Every structure is written in structure tokens, then in C-alpha cells.
């Protein structure tokens, strides 16, 4: 007769898999077909006062991460739109093309806001009589 009917299921976030942890630790570099995820070298460790008195050894250099970890992270990005092999994986950091395509679709051709990086641009100068109860 009548029971609990199932409705449409909401989709996940388009940038759900990309992690701020990765965006803070690593960064992507290189040509499009030879991208490498690199993080700064050195050993991070907290020790007592009086250790590593010489600073010349501590170097700020970037070394690439292991290829298996790079493949795992890239696959985490590749999760979205898996069936279309003709679509290149997403990027660790969103680019200008991505921010533009976020609203360049024809379903956003009427909205004046959200266009040309409204959320990215700093706010406008508010009115001088601006006040809230």
C-alpha cells in the first residue's frame, strides 16, 4: 500500500576528496603530464634548548615525495568523474580556469553575483550610514 518512499540522493562535494592537509604540506609542480608533488626537506623534531646550535645545516630545500604516495593522492583526486577517461584529474590547488568554469556554465549566465570571482575579490566599500539593529 504505502510505506516510506525513497527520494533523490544529494551528491557529495565536488572538492570533498582534496584535503587541506595535502594543500598545506605538499605542492604540485612540473609540466601537465609530469606533475610531481613536492614537500620541503629536512627532519621535523622538537628537542630541548641547547641542541642544533648551528643553523647552517638546517636547509630550506624541496624534495619530491614517494611515487606511491603521489599516486595515492592523485587517485584520491581522480575519484571524481572516474568513468570519463578523457577528463584529466583535478589539481591540488584550484586554478583560474576552475574558478571561472565554476560559473561559466549556462545555468549561471543570469546571476550577476558569483561571476568573475565575486567570492575571490575583496568586498566593496560599505555605505557610511550602514547600521544594524
Amino acid at each position: 500500500r504505502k510505506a516510506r518512499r525513497v527520494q533523490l540522493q544529494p551528491t557529495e562535494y565536488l572538492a570533498q576528496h582534496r584535503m587541506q592537509v595535502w594543500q598545506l604540506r605538499f605542492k604540485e609542480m612540473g609540466p601537465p603530464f609530469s606533475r610531481v608533488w613536492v614537500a620541503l626537506g629536512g627532519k621535523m623534531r622538537r628537542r630541548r634548548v641547547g641542541r642544533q646550535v648551528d643553523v647552517k645545516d638546517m636547509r630550506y630545500y624541496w624534495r619530491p615525495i614517494e611515487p606511491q604516495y603521489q599516486r595515492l593522492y592523485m587517485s584520491r583526486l581522480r575519484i571524481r568523474d572516474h568513468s570519463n577517461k578523457l577528463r584529466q584529474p583535478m589539481r591540488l590547488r584550484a586554478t583560474n580556469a576552475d574558478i571561472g568554469s565554476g560559473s561559466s556554465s549556462i545555468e549561471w549566465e543570469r546571476a550577476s553575483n558569483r561571476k568573475y570571482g565575486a567570492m575571490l575579490a575583496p568586498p566593496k566599500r560599505q555605505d557610511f550610514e550602514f547600521r544594524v539593529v
Binding site: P32, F33, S34, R35, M74, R78, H82, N84, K85, L86, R87, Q88, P89
Partner: protein
């Protein structure tokens, strides 16, 4: 094909050529927006045996003359930085080319290099030409004569050449320009 690093190690060249052994010679790269013609590859194409005659590089290159003209006009062939020129046509008028190659809207040549299974970011590339009109098989045979060892397929819409990069797309564009399309 000279190994500058090996020559420097053996003592046949001066040790100041390490930059030459490491980095290639700086040249304006051929692009879809900057037709940087390469005289060496064009001479190689002229030396290669083909049935159709190609125009001279002097006519393929845009003219470079004095720029004292006060106002510019709409000449078909004028000074251009990116090296854009209308199609010159066939080299010998008393001939019939079995195929015709149309350009795109921006005047770019049909050569487009894609990748096989690009989701995995695969380095293996291939070239697709989908603006050839006329006898596609004559164009395919000319591509055979150009790239002997490559796999070249043909369909009603596109001609595919597998295992060729931009380094082959530029050769294809050079041959097309020399032919006159």
C-alpha cells in the same frame, strides 16, 4: 647528433660548452598562436622524396622589410610577428592535388595532439587531423612517406597518427604549409 657532454669529457670541445651540453639551443617554439618556422626541418622535408612540390621557404616566411611606412593597410601578405600568412596554393599550377586541407576559425592548422587514456596522465600521445577533405587516402599515404615507422589510421572524419608528439605536429604543419594549405 653530437654529444657535447661526452666531447667535453673526452677533451674534444672547450669546457665552456657545458650550458650547451645541458640545455638545448634557445629557439622560439612553434605554437598554435606563433608559427615559428624551422628552416632545418623544412630543408629536411624538401630533401625527402615526395610526389608533390613544396613552395620555397622564402615564400613561406612572411616578408621582413623596412617599416618606414606611415600607415598600414590590408595587404594579404604583411609584416606579422607570429608569422601568419594566407595559403599560397600549389607550387606548380599544372597539377591537381587529390586532397584539400581546411583551416580552423582562428586560421590554425588541423594538427591536434591528444593522449591515449589521459585520465591516468599517460605520456603516450597521438595526433588527430579532422579537417582534411577530398581523398583522405592520398593524405594518409603522404603521411606514410613522412613518418615511415608510425601507425597511421584513417576514417571518414579523422586521420590518426600514433606515437607522435608536438615535434611531429610541427613537421606536419611545415609540410602542409609547403604544399600550400
Amino acid at each position: 647528433p653530437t654529444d657535447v657532454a661526452a666531447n667535453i669529457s673526452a677533451g674534444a670541445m672547450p669546457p665552456e660548452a657545458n650550458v650547451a651540453a645541458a640545455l638545448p639551443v634557445p629557439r622560439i617554439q612553434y605554437s598554435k598562436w606563433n608559427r615559428a618556422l624551422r628552416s632545418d626541418v623544412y630543408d629536411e622535408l624538401l630533401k625527402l622524396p615526395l610526389r608533390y612540390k613544396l613552395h620555397d621557404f622564402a615564400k613561406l616566411c612572411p616578408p621582413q622589410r623596412c617599416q618606414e611606412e606611415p600607415e598600414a593597410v590590408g595587404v594579404v601578405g604583411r609584416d606579422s610577428a607570429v608569422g601568419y600568412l594566407p595559403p599560397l596554393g600549389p607550387a606548380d599550377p599544372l597539377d591537381t592535388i587529390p586532397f584539400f586541407v581546411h583551416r580552423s576559425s582562428n586560421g590554425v592548422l588541423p594538427g591536434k595532439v591528444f593522449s591515449m587514456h589521459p585520465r591516468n596522465l599517460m605520456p603516450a600521445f597521438y595526433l588527430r587531423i579532422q579537417q582534411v577533405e577530398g581523398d583522405m587516402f592520398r593524405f594518409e599515404e603522404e603521411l606514410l612517406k613522412i613518418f615511415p615507422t608510425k601507425k597511421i589510421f584513417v576514417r571518414s572524419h579523422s586521420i590518426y597518427v600514433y606515437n607522435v608528439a608536438l615535434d611531429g605536429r610541427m613537421v606536419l604543419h611545415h609540410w602542409l604549409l609547403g604544399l600550400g594549405f
